[PDB]
Write a protein that binds this ligand. Structure first.
Ligand SMILES: Nc1ncnc2c1ncn2[C@@H]1O[C@H](COP(=O)(O)O)[C@@H](O)[C@H]1O
Ligand SMILES: Nc1ncnc2c1ncn2[C@@H]1O[C@H](COP(=O)(O)O)[C@@H](O)[C@H]1O
Ligand SMILES: Nc1ncnc2c1ncn2[C@@H]1O[C@H](COP(=O)(O)O)[C@@H](O)[C@H]1O
Lengths: 346, 329, 338, 338
């Protein structure tokens, strides 16, 4: 697994198991959550759940995250959060800032037995989630004039681009593409690109390509598969858009998309769909999203065998046959029946 | 009776794709004379020319990515003429296999501002700031252009693409000014907002929900290329740039085709179609209505079409089918 | 500069309001002459009971317009001018009518050139009236210094710009000593301490009406409140041939709307293609000069001027037998050889 | 005329903002001299963390004010000037400080008379700053043509009104070629095509600082951005005796606030009655001249001018041994015999 965000294992010596913080989250979170707990149980995962609550405090007007949850998550070097609502400083933002998360990993692959307009889409994108267009820095320079400031540093760039080379290696993809726009953002995007070009050399097994978002978006939409040996790295904004785009190609929404937020020693794995408050409790949610983030987590932890088990078989395979599936995929099954129907081929 | 239009072939398939238009033009004996220019900083002479003639037809220039490279000079042209509005036309064509069919959307972007403002510096080594400017005047301008455009071409919906949830001042201002002046002027038109990333997802998955999209420089490049792909490719997209005094017409997709320069494989549909846009502009348009039907029917009519659409014909051959169909109208 | 006339890469977007009566035909004449001359303007054209809103809203975008006249009811539950509504709502406060005789037209007194500037928003057009007890009606006529200083300067400014030597205020100040009094003073007052190069004078509306009909050459520019301008206007209209030969324009600070200077709807001859478009076209040329074109204006005015001077092929009311259609085409024809 | 200074049957209502430090005492001095001269003005007086709102709101009613200085923290969680807040929120964009030496005061270079006009709302006082990565801080200094043309004209207008022959722009345009460049140009540029009777020139801020200290008589009027004005200001303050002798005033389009020209709080000597009110009083006279009184102004200035020239009975910092209280009463005394 990638050297950069390395898990420091250590199963809890008293139990055979590893400790993982949950964060069930709200809305369809609870149901989607225990759905995962059950499937995990069945496969005999070396994992005990230490669920914690990230409902924000407000130390110094600036929104902070509760000590209970901090201690828990800093301890077990990993957590798996479901969706949460919109409670004075982005909840997700103060979540990355307090745990040093700096890289968003977003895969979008076609699902077996769910037909969308685009086919054979298997995409992987790493996004810088620290700086870039999304630093808090903007100014009113005078009456009707505003500056939003895009920040790009070598330190922040280096460590994302690394995780990308190392992740591309860890999943056996030859090519790694740096999406940019050095064309008109000479210095900003130029630095990003050079930093990749310089790192390129200490990863000779991978081939580095450079592409303008221009083409990255043109080419991916004309033919998604041209990047099935991908791993694309890019600064915060291009990343935020391309990843939400990639998901649009793979599934037409993002109710199937898993994300991984890698930090230096910590790392959080979440589903990117919302809290779906109106379907909450009625048992219609679709664990697949969070479930795949579980797999991502497994691999990040080193539990290859279990991950491949829960992914290659189960869900991925049980999402074949409309008696299974959920309402969101034409299927008729409940969150309930999806989970047992999954564990069968588990 | 004779217009004198500026012609800027530019880099890549530029030279070939322009020629296609010339040929179709003299073969239709259209009363326009090209003043044609070629060029490192003589982007001056392009400006100076356009300032005389007011109207131009151009391909794309190439832009370096290296540090000591010169800088767009496609944007230089626009900034120096304050041709602030870009219009790209993404309408699918009959004889072209596309994944989602019957698609008709327009993307209007601001040309001179936003992330194309080209202000950047390195404070200490390894730390770079790129400043993105957004100003009320330049924004009210494009906002009205978009609505005016939507009214003129009976478009019912106008949507502002932004990232105002994160860049609350920059993109915020943009989203407000647009919706703000689509409500107290242009009340007949449906104004709305959409976040650029989510817009990107709908565009690829369910594009029919969009009509007209107004965006700052960057988001327009992105949604632009989504639209370009959606309809077949960069060779099918008509484009035009508008300032108050001048108008420059170019392909709506904005690709140089450096790799296939001189190979006569290129597709001139883009160039020709935006060339027709120019005719409608300077009032001709009997010709425009004409020579558009020509290319439209040509490509719908299976083979004899150019490589990238799924044919095996060369730029040369495709051109001549148009001039041929045209000779019998 | 969100305050100049709508323009996109060399192309103005002007408002077009055909309006009632021969309006629709007389406007068309201009359209045809315009595209036949390939003039870089695009019409945003509107049609309409209270959508006089949409005319206003349009003009507020484009700043410039070209219009015919709407019709106005005389009955009690009729809607009200809405020609004046348009002007009041845009504060297009100054009307200019151009009464200059034309070469090929038989008129009782020839070689006549006078201008009538009237205030549009005030005076007897203020539309304030009530019935106290049954059978007793009061119509209030408002006159205010601000609105009056405004028109006064517009008139002088206009006279200076177009090298007019004399400006005369028409009034009834001997009877309405406050209302028309104020008007007469403010005009003469600010023609003396500003614009000293111009000859300012007064004339009583009734006596003005008599001189106008009998000895019109004594007048140069006439400034009047809403009513007297309608009256002197029609005298001038007759003097030169008729309502079909009179160019007109309306000015506010921000907007400008160009219409016929005579202000008749021609309801009776609607759709008959008998109408005369000289009025519309000529005030259409006024609009070109305005938005800076005017190579075209100088052009297409000479066209119509020569056309009507050149005997037959002219339209019914001037003494010809040609239709609106035919007259138009003679202009476009003469134009195609300039 | 809801835009002149608050006035009711002959009585102005002026805003009074004592502010921090010797503020409270130095203002009182003026009050006393004012009622002892029975000047027809009534103080609306305000005291205050973010009620800098109430100061603004007051001044917006009365249009005119008289104030001392507030204190400003240097710590990170401190609130921020709110002396500048007052000015920015009222767009009182022009500061005038008057450095004219006084007869009874020992100064190293005597007979000195120069004025420093600074822009209040922009420059390095724009208060835009951020920390990109830890330990790296950028402070953005804004300079805009509109705000700069404004101060430029104010300065020349001022120089013309008070028969000043020379106006000099202080800048660092050789290094900050865009920022200070723009400033230097716009000034010299519009001192040449307007105000041709006045001698315009430039001087580099550092070299200006050196001449000011060594050979100040060469300067007449100095126009500067926010920062350079604080610096040249204090040079001038020292040159004539100290911060207690400097009259000052702030101007916008609509409002005017009068304060000491030197801008020091005197926190250390608060409540000690040792302070010198010459500054406050003299800029208080500036305010009278402003709201048209000035019989009083001409008066009570001669009072303080003669008082301090007349040796002892003067306050501590000038070289006397009298208290604020005693100095005040000598003025009111001299005044009672004029
Ligand atoms: N004239 C043309 N006809 C068809 N495709 C083109 C043409 N010019 C450029 N392209 C496409 O656009 C891409 C060029 O983009 P870039 O790599 O940015 O130069 C190529 O992959 C081509 O497939
Ligand atoms: N556009 C026009 N040009 C010339 N004469 C007109 C026009 N419209 C109406 N007239 C004449 O004026 C009379 C009716 O005027 P009105 O008051 O507009 O109904 C008719 O007898 C027509 O001869
Ligand atoms: N009323 C006053 N007259 C003369 N000097 C003063 C007065 N108030 C304060 N100062 C001086 O200005 C300094 C205070 O300014 P600051 O450094 O801003 O606190 C003190 O060192 C005093 O010596």
């Amino acid at each position: 697994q990638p050297s950069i965000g390395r898990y420091t294992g250590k199963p809890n010596p008293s139990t055979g198991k590893y400790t993982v913080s949950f964060i069930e989250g709200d809305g369809i979170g609870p149901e989607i959550s225990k759905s995962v707990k059950k499937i995990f149980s069945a496969a005999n995962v070396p994992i005990e759940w230490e669920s914690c609550d990230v409902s924000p405090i407000f130390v110094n007007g600036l929104t902070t995250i509760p000590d209970p949850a901090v201690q828990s998550i800093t301890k077990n070097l990993v957590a798996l959060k479901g969706p949460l609502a919109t409670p004075h400083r982005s909840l997700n933002l103060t979540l990355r800032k307090t745990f040093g998360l700096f890289a968003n990993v977003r895969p979008a692959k076609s699902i077996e037995g769910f037909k969308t307009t685009y086919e054979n889409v298997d995409l992987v994108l790493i996004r810088e989630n620290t700086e870039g267009e999304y630093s808090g820095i903007e100014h009113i320079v005078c009456p009707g004039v505003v500056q939003s400031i895009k920040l790009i540093t070598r330190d922040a760039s280096e460590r994302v681009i690394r995780y990308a080379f190392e992740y591309a290696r860890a999943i056996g993809r030859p090519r790694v593409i740096v999406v940019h726009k050095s064309t008109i953002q000479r210095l900003a995007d130029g630095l990003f690109v050079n930093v990749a070009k310089e790192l390129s050399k200490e990863y000779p097994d991978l081939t580095l390509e450079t592409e303008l978002i221009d083409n990255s978006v043109l080419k991916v939409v004309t033919n998604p598969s041209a990047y099935t040996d991908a791993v694309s790295v890019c600064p915060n904004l291009y990343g935020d858009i391309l990843s939400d785009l990639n998901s649009g190609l793979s599934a037409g929404s993002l109710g199937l998309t898993p994300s991984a937020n890698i930090g230096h020693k910590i790392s959080i794995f979440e589903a990117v769909h919302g809290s779906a408050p109106d379907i909450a409790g009625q048992d219609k949610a679709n664990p697949t999203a969070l479930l795949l983030s579980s797999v991502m987590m497994l691999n990040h932890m080193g539990l290859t065998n279990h991950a491949d088990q829960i992914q290659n078989a189960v869900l991925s395979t049980i999402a074949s046959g409309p008696e299974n599936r959920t309402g969101d995929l034409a299927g008729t099954a409940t969150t309930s029946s999806f989970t047992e129907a999954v564990i069968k081929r588990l | 009776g004779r217009f004198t239009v500026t012609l800027i072939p530019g880099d890549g398939v530029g030279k070939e794709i322009t020629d296609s238009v010339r040929t179709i033009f003299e073969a239709e004996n259209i009363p326009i004379d090209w003043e044609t220019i070629n060029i490192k900083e003589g982007v001056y002479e392009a400006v100076e020319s356009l300032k005389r003639n007011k109207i131009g037809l151009k391909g794309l220039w190439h832009t370096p990515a290296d540090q000591t490279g010169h800088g767009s000079l496609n944007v230089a042209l626009r900034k120096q003429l304050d041709i602030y509005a870009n219009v790209a036309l993404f309408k699918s064509l009959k004889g072209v296999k596309t994944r989602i069919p019957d698609i008709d959307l327009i993307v209007i972007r601001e040309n001179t501002e936003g992330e194309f403002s080209g202000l950047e510096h390195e404070s200490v080594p390894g730390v770079v700031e790129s400043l993105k400017v957004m100003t009320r005047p330049k924004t009210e301008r494009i906002a009205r252009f978009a609505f005016d455009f939507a009214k003129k071409y009976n478009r019912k919906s106008v949507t502002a693409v932004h990232k105002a949830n994160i860049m609350k001042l920059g993109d915020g201002l943009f989203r407000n000014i647009i919706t703000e002046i689509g409500q107290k002027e242009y009340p007949d038109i449906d104004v709305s907002s959409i976040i650029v990333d989510n817009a990107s997802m709908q565009a690829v998955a369910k594009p029919h929900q969009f009509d007209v999209l107004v965006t700052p420089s960057m988001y327009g490049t992105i949604l632009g290329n989504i639209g370009a792909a959606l309809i077949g490719g960069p060779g099918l997209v008509a484009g035009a740039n508008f300032g108050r005094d001048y108008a420059v017409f170019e392909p709506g997709s904005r690709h140089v085709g450096l790799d296939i320069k001189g190979q006569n494989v290129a597709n001139p549909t883009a160039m020709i179609l935006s060339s027709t846009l120019m005719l409608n502009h300077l009032g001709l348009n009997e010709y425009a209505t004409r020579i558009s039907k020509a290319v439209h029917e040509t490509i719908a009519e299976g083979k004899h079409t150019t490589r990238d659409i799924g044919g095996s014909s060369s730029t040369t051959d495709f051109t001549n089918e148009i001039i041929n169909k045209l000779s019998t109208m």
